[PDB]
């Protein structure tokens, strides 16, 4: 609250070349669950803390990942609908990149059709920006990719990402790995190595139980598409994780 005048609106500039409504949205992401994505030698794996407020919620069908056309995924941490409003633009234009060019949309050219859209909200006045910071990556001709989206409109290419309230923590355990393994994790240890983190990142919220979710894309184990998990793969990854921290 440095400026009581320069916050009531958007499309302004403070004396210090700033616009603060973006600098307040970012404090709505912080009040959101944790979500990550690891880059791998073949593809990527995503994850999230999926909190549960009651005992009454059905398991494994209030999912939070949104799958774009078969080769890129997007996970949120923040205000969900402004998110789901956003993929539901990313899930349509990519078609309009296909029906003109016939290739599946690459990952970067999918970003600039988002990272350029979001920036539009933060220059008009009759709108509100987005309170999300969504991670998205996938696979294409020229390898894997992984990015972060941030309501300022910025996006950058990350080997590891983490948002929400478990930012300061998971930005450590993703620094360790990239020192041990410069050579690229495989897509059957990163996964369980992700579960280790969300069980470590929960401890800002040791009050309440929760549920864990994963979604994963890499060429070898999947043939180059996006997919959820099921079965022994995640169950062992659960069993892997809460073991090591007890």
């Amino acid at each position: 609250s440095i400026g009581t005048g320069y916050d009531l609106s958007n499309s302004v500039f403070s004396p210090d070349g700033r616009n603060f409504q973006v600098e307040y949205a970012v404090k709505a992401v912080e009040n959101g669950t944790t979500s990550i994505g690891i880059k791998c030698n073949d593809g990527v794996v995503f994850a999230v803390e999926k909190l549960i407020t009651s005992k009454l919620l059905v398991p494994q069908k209030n999912v939070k990942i949104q799958v774009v056309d078969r080769h890129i995924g997007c996970v949120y941490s923040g205000l969900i609908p402004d998110g789901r409003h956003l993929v539901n633009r990313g899930r349509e234009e990519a078609a309009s990149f296909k029906k003109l060019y016939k290739t599946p949309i690459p990952i970067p050219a999918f970003a600039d059709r988002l990272g350029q859209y979001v920036q539009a909200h933060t220059l008009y006045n009759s709108v509100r920006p987005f309170g999300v910071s969504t991670i998205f990556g996938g696979v294409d001709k020229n390898g894997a990719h992984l990015y972060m989206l941030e309501p300022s409109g910025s996006y950058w290419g990350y080997k590891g990402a983490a948002t929400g309230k478990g930012r300061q923590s998971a930005k450590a355990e993703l620094e360790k790995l990239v020192d041990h393994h410069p050579e690229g994790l495989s897509a059957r240890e990163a996964v369980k190595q992700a579960a280790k983190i969300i069980y470590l990142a929960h401890e800002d919220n040791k009050e309440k139980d929760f549920e864990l979710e994963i979604s994963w894309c890499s060429l070898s184990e999947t043939n180059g598409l996006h997919k959820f998990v099921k079965g022994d793969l995640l169950q062992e990854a659960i069993d892997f994780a809460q073991k090591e921290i007890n």
Partner: protein, 38 residues
């Protein structure tokens, strides 16, 4: 009959308040709703 003195001094403080002023520029909004915002 009486030899004492009194020595009425100003040991007490005092004050006079009419701090009357002029400007009051407090807060003019000419953008109560930004007038079409655009």
């Amino acid at each position: 009959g009486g030899k004492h003195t009194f020595n009425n001094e100003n040991v007490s403080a005092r004050l006079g308040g009419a701090s009357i002023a002029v400007q009051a520029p407090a807060q003019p909004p000419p953008y109560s709703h930004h007038h079409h915002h655009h």
